[PDB]
Each structure stands twice: as C-alpha cells, then as structure tokens.
Design a protein around this nucleic acid. Structure first.
Lengths: 88, 100, 116, 65, 65, 49
RNA sequence: GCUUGAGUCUCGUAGAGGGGGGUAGAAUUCCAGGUGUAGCGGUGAAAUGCGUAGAGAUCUGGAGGAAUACCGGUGGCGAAGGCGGCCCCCUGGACGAAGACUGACGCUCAGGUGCGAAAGCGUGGGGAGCAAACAGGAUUAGAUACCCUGGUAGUCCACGCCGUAAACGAUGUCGACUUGGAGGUUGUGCCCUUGAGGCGUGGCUUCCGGAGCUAACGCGUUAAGUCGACCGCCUGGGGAGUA
RNA sequence: GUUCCCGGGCCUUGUACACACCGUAACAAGGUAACCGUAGGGGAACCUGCGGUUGGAUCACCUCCU
C-alpha cells in the first residue's frame, strides 16, 4: 500500500508546505508516483482482469486533472511538466 | 525493520543439538540488523498426530525483529533443515514478551 | 488363533448393506458378517434387524479366537450404527470402548451420485 | 467420538457421535456435488427460521382466546 | 453474559492452547459464533489460528485417523 | 440463568462459579501486618508463600 | 475570485478480490505383501461386471488428478461476471477521526476499446470421480428415456479464436431529498473501553410498514416515492430475436 | 378408542383449468420441479454435463434430553 518515505519526499519538493498537497502540481505527482510503482505489476502476472479497473480509473482521473490545469494555469502546467516530466 | 514471529519446531533427536542451531540462525540476525523479543523453550511436549512414526516434538519460538529479505532466505533454510520440520513466519504489528 | 483379545470389529454400514469385518489392531482379519450375506435381499437389508442378524453372525466366528474387551470402530452411519453396536453389547461382549473413528474427507475428490 | 465409561453403562452410549455430526457430513459427501443446491434450500429454510420468531411476535401482543 | 469477553481485547493468540479447548469440543469440532456468546470477528479469528495450530501439530484434525 | 448455563459450559470449567469472599482488613482499622501464621494442609503443602 | 460538488496525501483495518509458484492432510482408482470370506454392488425389482487367476473388507509404504466437511453468517469483496485451506511477493477498490488546497477540474453516449461463467476447437502434457455418441440387462407393445456397470469428448495447467445467457434483487448510471423497529457485517470519535455498553456517522444486504406511486402484489433511505442530466428499447401475437 | 376402512363437512395449500383432471416433457412435489445460455446426439418430445435464479412444494410424523 504505497511507499510513504518516497511520496512524502515528493510533497516536500512540490509543496510550499508539508500539509499542502491540495494544489494541482502536487496531487497529480502523487498520482504518477502510484503509476511509477504500478508498472511493476503490469509487467508481470498477465491475468489481472481485476487490477485492470484500477488502471483505467487512475488514468482517467489523471488525464482530466492535467486537462484543467492546462485550461487555467499554463504557468504551473508548463512548470509541472518541466518539474516532474509527466508529459512523457 | 519488520516484526516477525518465526515459530518453528524440531524432533526430540535434534533437541539436544538445536540450542547450537538457534545460535546458528540468531547469528545472522545479530550481524544484520536484529533483536529478539521472545525466545521460548517449551521442551519435548506432546504433539498432536505422530510425524510418520514418533510423536512429541521440541517447540522453539523466536519472535524476532529482522529484515524481510533475510527471513525470506532464512525460511528457505528452514524448508531444508533436518531439525526444523514445520515453521510459520508472520507479518508486522506488535512484539511479544510473555506468552506464559 | 492369533491369540487376540482386542477384536477390532469394523462396522461399516453403506446404505443398503451392513458389512462388519472383525480384525486385529495390526489388520489381521478374522472374518465377517453381513445383513446381505444372511439373506434379507431388498429393503430388508436396509433394516437394522438384518443388521441385528449381522451383529450375531459377527458374534460368532470368534469362538475360536476369543475377543472379550473388544473395540467397536464404527464408520458408515447408514442402516447399522444403532441395533448393531447394541447387539454386540447384547451378545455377551464387554466393549472396552465404542469408537467412531471417521477420517472424514474435506470432500477433496468427487463422490458418486444418487436419488434424482 | 470415543465413548468409554468404565462401568456404569449397561448401554452403548453413542450420543456425542450424533451430537457431533453423524448425518451432518453423510448427507454432504454421499451424493453428487451440485454446488448451488444448499444455497437455494437454505433460502426457504431461513425465511421459515424467521417465521417462528414471527410467531413469537405473534403470540406476545394478543391471543385473547 | 460472561466475564471473559469483558476483559478480552484484541486478537486472541495461537501459542498456548489451553483456552482453545474452550472453543472446540473434545472431538475436534468448532463452535459457531452463535452458540458461543462471541461476535463473529472473534470466533472466526480464533478459528483460522487453529488451522495454523494443525500445521504446527498443537491440535490434530479429527480425534483418530 | 439459562443464558449463562450454556456460556458456562464453553468458557472453561469455572467461569462464573468461583467468587471473591476473601478475609478482609477489619472495617475501621489502620495498622501494619508484621507476622503471618500459616498452616498448610495436613499432608499436602501450599504453593509458594 | 469564494466554497457545501469531484479528487489526493499524512495516520489505519478487514476481506471465497484477482495473479505466478510451492506445500500439508484425509478420501478414492490402482500396485506389492500378511489375514480371510463367498458374497460385493444396485434398485420399487432384476440385471451387466468381478469372484479358488481369490473381488468387497483391514493395516503399512506410495505415484498421478481435481477439489477444500466442521470455522459458514437473505455474510464478505467487485463495474459486472464470478469466486471458499496456508505461505511469500505484487496490488486494485471501498471507508473513517483532524487539517492543508487548485477552485465545479462533474455526468454519460452512436462509430470505438476492455472483462466475459460454462461450452466448442487448435497445441505441449493429462484422465482418480462423474460422464454426450454407444453397448448389455429390464420398466415397456417400443428405447436410442428415470436406474447400474464400462467408456471417447469435456473437466485441469499455459497461450488464443467465434465473442454468447434467466450476464435477473428482471429494478440502467452520477447525485440531492423523504416519520421507525429487529438485525447482521466492517471501522471510528467522545465518557471511567470500571463491564458484556450509551450518543452520532459511511459502504453492502434482508423482513414489516407511513408519505407517494400502482392493475395488483407490493417496493419502501439498497425503491417501483420526488427531479435534473445521458443512452438504448416498444407500437397486438406469430413469422423471429431467424435466413 | 379414532390410529384401520366407505361416504360427508369445515379450515388450508396449489393450478397456463373455468368449454372447470407416436409419447406424458410442463400445470398437485404431475409420484423426475421449472426456464434461460452452450456443445452434441437421437423418428421425435427432450435428455446428459456445467453455470445461475425463484416466474417452485411439505416442513407434517416417528424415537431421545428440560
């Protein structure tokens, strides 16, 4: 269930506080962190007709979150894609 | 790092040389991050069903604090030791101290 | 023969048959008795009265051996299990202990099938 | 499972055997599996199991017979 | 109604089996969460621990094989 | 009670039978126990004290 | 720009949830050995088969194979389908005490994509039990039909294809609102958890009822009650959910 | 004395019935409960195996503990 002493390091970087993980720039990164440790499962085992609903779920959530940041703050979005590299 | 509760057993034959075998396993833990919580010695108490012939085995509980990748290979050793016939490793949670 | 005192009478009652097989603790059988080997072909084998006749055919063929403090190891709660253990305690036997040694399966394999 | 009692019997005493299961696992491992069956019959069984308690609630309020 | 589940808190262990005798019968049969005045949580966790006590030879399966 | 006869034959041999009817410090006294005169069962010893 | 909407983190729990592999034990088919009998099996009844080439029965050792009695609870997980030993690793989803924020980032659909019990088949292995086609004896005027003994396909492990259902609490989905009781299952906050509890809050599910709907039965905070948003379907039956 | 047997009444359960009880596969539990999905087969209904559901029936007697 998540890797706490890696993700807390992430909120330390992106956040202006330690309690501030409500800003778009920090939350999508914690979401990508989930995906960084999710690759480890979608590489092996092959028969996850259950774990598949998690993929489509968190990817949908992520696609539209960066889809709003794009429509409002291009300052934070271009800095965000340049801060984590979540574009590719 | 992680709290483990390794509970293994041996046959009364190796019961006179298992104390040396406990020094075997606890050697690793000591030199690789570890401290024991409850080393229990019950003796050659009455078993349930005879293990292919003889009953009454020797119970030895550890319940030690050790690293996950060491106990992984350590249970592999239990798997192929002639003293330890059956074992049981746990997850984290609380550490014990009495159990008596 | 065998110099046995511990006559282990394995009473197994399938459904329509009460087959009791007296043996030794080692397995050295002494012989048997059945609700179907005495007659009663039909729903008559299904009756414990035939199982009663069964416990009697088992009460004999042991007067050459000599079972006294016998053990009643029951399995198969079909037609017998009642007027069979009671027939032995009425045939002149001092049962040290009546055992229901049933090594029940966890239904690992698949069993047969009946009444549909 | 194993009944003994050294002397005060004058009877077989197989009452804990029946008090164990007896026909309990007999009726379950003697005939075809058919995985779904018990589920449905426990259905009619459960509704009639609440029915006697519904009869317990049916005897407490009136019965001025 | 008993002074044991009024002092019984947080997962009853699998080491000494003296109190496991107080949930099983002298046959090897377990009592359901309804007879024993104990919430399913507890009667069920005690149970899983007992299967592990079988892999450890504390309690056998049925009495005799 | 019937709701404790059943629970009685489960949670042990002595669940709600043995009570506490000890010999208590006499009501209205405040002193100091100095010596204990004990008499073990004629034939069988006590436990430890 | 601001928050009652959506969402994530700090701090945690439970689970027939899925996945790859390994392992424990009983039973069953069968093999070797000691004992031993003439019956076992089956049905309303008879019979095929086995039997002095010694079956069924009992004890010891054991190799394939599939599946987990008792714990079991109109209980739990999930989009749904579906799914009951244990361990190691991986991991999705649901929920809660107290705070921190961008500030409606929300809902759904033709073409499209993915899951898909069981079955059919191709392929490297397999066959204990049951058992399509079929054979023997009977019920019968007749049996290719209830029954029993055998038995190919299938069942299982891994990769794919046609891509189907009573895939049905028949109740589409996100969400807000609407007197209670018996409860069950899983967490949490407050008070002395002295104690088997008292007061509130979310998820899933069952029964009796008010509001309301209705042909009626009844559903009834999980609605068939009240609205908004998105899609599919119907115009009597059959033809046909087929060429 | 109502447990056997013939006829009768009341209450109750059940029905695709009310024109009203070549082979029985559904309607009483039709003496083998039903239907959908799939493969195969037989003059033919339907049956066999696997998965699901309730658009299914009685829970009345005979032996034991308070």
């Amino acid at each position: 269930s998540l890797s706490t002493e890696a993700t807390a390091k992430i909120v330390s970087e992106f956040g202006r506080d330690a309690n501030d993980t409500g800003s778009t720039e920090v939350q999508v990164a914690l979401l990508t962190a989930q995906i960084n440790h999710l690759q480890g499962h979608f590489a092996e085992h092959k028969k996850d007709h259950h774990s598949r609903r998690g993929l489509l779920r968190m990817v949908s959530q992520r696609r539209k979150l960066l889809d709003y940041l794009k429509r409002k703050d291009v300052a934070r979005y271009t800095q965000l894609i340049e801060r984590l590299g979540l574009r590719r | 790092m992680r709290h483990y509760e390794i509970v293994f057993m041996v046959h009364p034959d190796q019961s006179e040389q298992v104390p040396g075998m406990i020094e075997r396993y606890t050697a690793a833990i000591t030199g690789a991050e570890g401290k024991i919580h409850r080393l229990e010695d019950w003796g050659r108490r009455q078993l349930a069903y005879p293990i292919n012939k003889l009953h009454k085995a020797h119970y030895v509980l550890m319940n030690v604090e050790a690293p996950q990748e060491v106990i992984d290979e350590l249970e592999t050793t239990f798997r192929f030791n002639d003293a330890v016939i059956r074992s049981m490793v746990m997850r984290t949670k609380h550490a014990v101290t009495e159990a008596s | 023969r065998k110099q046995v005192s511990d006559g282990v009478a394995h009473i197994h009652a399938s459904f329509n048959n009460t087959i009791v097989t007296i043996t030794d603790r080692q397995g050295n059988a002494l012989g048997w008795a059945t609700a179907g080997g005495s007659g009663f072909r039909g729903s008559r084998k299904s009756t414990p009265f035939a199982a009663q006749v069964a416990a009697e055919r088992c009460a004999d063929a042991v007067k050459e051996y000599g079972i006294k403090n016998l053990e009643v190891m029951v399995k198969g709660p079909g037609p017998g299990r009642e007027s069979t253990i009671r027939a032995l305690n009425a045939a002149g036997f001092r049962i040290t202990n009546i055992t229901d040694v049933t090594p029940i399966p966890h239904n690992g394999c698949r069993p047969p099938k009946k009444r549909r | 499972i194993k009944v003994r009692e050294n002397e005060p019997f004058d009877v077989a005493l197989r009452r804990f055997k029946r008090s164990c299961e007896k026909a309990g696992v007999l009726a379950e491992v003697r005939r075809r599996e058919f995985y779904e069956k018990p589920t449905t019959e426990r259905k009619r069984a459960k509704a009639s199991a609440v029915k006697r308690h519904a009869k317990k609630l049916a005897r407490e309020n009136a019965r001025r017979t | 109604f008993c002074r044991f589940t009024a002092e019984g808190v947080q997962e009853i262990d699998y080491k000494d089996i003296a109190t496991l005798k107080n949930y099983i019968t002298e046959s090897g049969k377990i009592v359901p969460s309804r007879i024993t005045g104990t919430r399913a949580k507890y009667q069920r966790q005690l149970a899983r621990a007992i299967k592990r006590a079988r892999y450890l030879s504390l309690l056998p399966y049925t009495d005799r094989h | 009670t019937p709701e404790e006869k059943l629970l009685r034959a489960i949670f042990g041999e002595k669940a709600s039978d043995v009570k506490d009817s000890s010999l208590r410090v006499p009501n209205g006294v405040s002193g100091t126990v100095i010596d204990v005169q004990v008499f073990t069962r004629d034939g069988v010893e006590k436990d430890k004290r």
